[PDB]
TrEMBL record:
Belongs to the histone deacetylase family. HD type 2 subfamily. Keywords: Actin-binding, Cell projection, Chromatin regulator, Cytoplasm, Cytoskeleton, Hydrolase, Metal-binding, Methylation, Nucleus, Phosphoprotein, Repeat, Repressor, Transcription, Transcription regulation, Transferase, Ubl conjugation, Ubl conjugation pathway, Zinc, Zinc-finger. The keyword Lyase does not apply. This is Protein deacetylase HDAC6. The keyword Transport does not apply. It is found in: Cell projection, Axon; Cell projection, Dendrite; Cytoplasm, Cytoskeleton, Cilium basal body; Cytoplasm, Cytoskeleton, Microtubule organizing center, Centrosome. GO terms for cellular component: axon; centrosome; dendrite; nucleus; perikaryon. It comes from Danio rerio. It comes from the Eukaryota. Zn(2+) binds at residues 171, 173, 264. One of its GO terms (molecular function) is transferase activity. GO terms for biological process: angiogenesis; chromatin organization; definitive hemopoiesis; hematopoietic progenitor cell differentiation; mitochondrion localization; negative regulation of cellular component organization; positive regulation of cellular component organization; regulation of microtubule-based process. Its main location: other.
Length: 353
């Protein structure tokens, strides 16, 4: 009945040479770690060591070319780091970026290992850079390799290839890379909540809309819950979990739950525009703990208000440790969104009928 925690300050070395105020700050992870200490959560966890992902583990989800190109940045001069970064959508690169992305992924592998070997029940991974925009063949949106996707495949690689993994992605952005990597896969259920605004919200693709339900054997195993019409918060997220995430997840009956846990839907986030509270994130975590015999790994993705993400992710760890959850009409467009997803997925999930 133990909660694992992974954090390594080396992941702070990834930085933006040209704009030291870029919102994907090194101190994102140290602020979260400090708040865990400050709230006396750290001493209640089992510390799991960070490690580098291997290049063969990266090949679970990424092409050898993508791996080689990102690895080549390790010794690039600033001019070439700027040029390579600019070939992607919203990427900055320093000489330490590749190392840090390996550390983020390997830390989560070690956390998934600790859960699956029974050394801990659940775990939290305070990692950067994030992962969920990363595609098989390209970097995107502050992400180099798809940490959560890789962790799902790593978990399958040490148990069975068809181990049922649920990925709940509550970062305010669509995890396009995660969706694409698993789009034909019935072993990995991807559920994303994200601001959409009819394609105007980053990453600006109709791939994030509710009618993208998966392909082939994966049809039904991709659930997009897209928000339109401005600011959402706890009522909308609790409703989406009650009508959609939890009924589908229970029917899927995952053997492992990964949370792509960006905290940029948080109150105070400058990039998400939403108002999910730390208590709200606590309740979302508490709900997910009812799945997979409690085998839940929470993985930091985005989230840019340092105070918001520190309080929100700490509230999640508090829930993993077994603490009692803390203590409103939906916006009309949120009801429309939830009903659109319900109609899209009732063909595949009996719990929605
Ligand atoms: C496009 C916009 C949404 N951004 C990129 C982004 C990507 C991923 C996440 C995330 O959290 N994904 O899960 C959050 C933000 S930006 O930060 O505001 C931004 C930063 C810059 F440095 C720029 F030069 C620039 F033009 C710019 F738009
Ligand atoms: K998401
Ligand atoms: K899928
Ligand atoms: Zn995000």
């Amino acid at each position: 009945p133990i909660t694992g925690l992974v954090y390594d300050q080396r992941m702070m070395l990834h930085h933006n040479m040209w704009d030291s105020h870029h919102p994907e700050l090194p101190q994102r992870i140290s602020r979260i770690f400090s708040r865990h200490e400050e709230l006396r959560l750290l001493s209640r966890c089992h510390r799991i060591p960070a490690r580098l992902a291997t290049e063969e583990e990266l090949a679970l989800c990424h092409s050898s070319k993508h791996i080689s190109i990102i690895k080549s940045s390790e010794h690039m001069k600033p001019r070439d780091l700027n040029r390579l970064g600019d070939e992607y959508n919203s990427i900055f690169i320093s000489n330490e970026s590749y190392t840090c992305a390996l550390l983020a992924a390997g830390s989560c592998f070690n956390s998934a290992q600790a859960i699956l070997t029974g050394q801990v029940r659940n775990a939290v991974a305070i990692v950067r850079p994030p992962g969920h925009h990363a595609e098989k063949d390209t970097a995107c949106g502050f992400c180099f390799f798809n940490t959560a996707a890789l962790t799902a495949r790593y978990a399958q690689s040490i148990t069975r290839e068809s181990l049922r993994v649920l990925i709940v992605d509550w970062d305010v952005h669509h995890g396009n890379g995660t969706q694409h990597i698993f789009e034909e896969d019935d072993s990995v259920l991807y559920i994303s909540l994200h601001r959409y605004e009819d394609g105007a919200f980053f990453p600006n693709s109709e791939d994030a809309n509710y009618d993208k339900v998966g392909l082939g054997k994966g049809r039904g195993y991709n659930v997009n819950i897209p928000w339109n019409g401005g600011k959402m918060g706890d009522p909308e997220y609790m409703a989406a979990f009650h009508h959609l995430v939890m009924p589908i997840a229970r029917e899927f009956a995952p053997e492992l739950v990964l949370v792509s846990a960006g905290f940029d839907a948080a109150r105070g986030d400058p990039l998400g525009g939403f108002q999910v509270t730390p208590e709200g994130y606590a309740h979302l975590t508490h709900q997910l703990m009812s799945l997979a015999a409690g085998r839940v790994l929470i993985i930091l993705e985005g989230g840019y208000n340092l105070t918001s993400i520190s309080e929100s992710m700490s509230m999640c760890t508090s829930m993993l440790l077994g603490d009692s959850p803390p203590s409103t009409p939906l916006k009309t467009s949120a009801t429309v969104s939830i009903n659109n997803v319900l109609r899209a997925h009732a063909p595949f999930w009996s719990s929605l009928r």
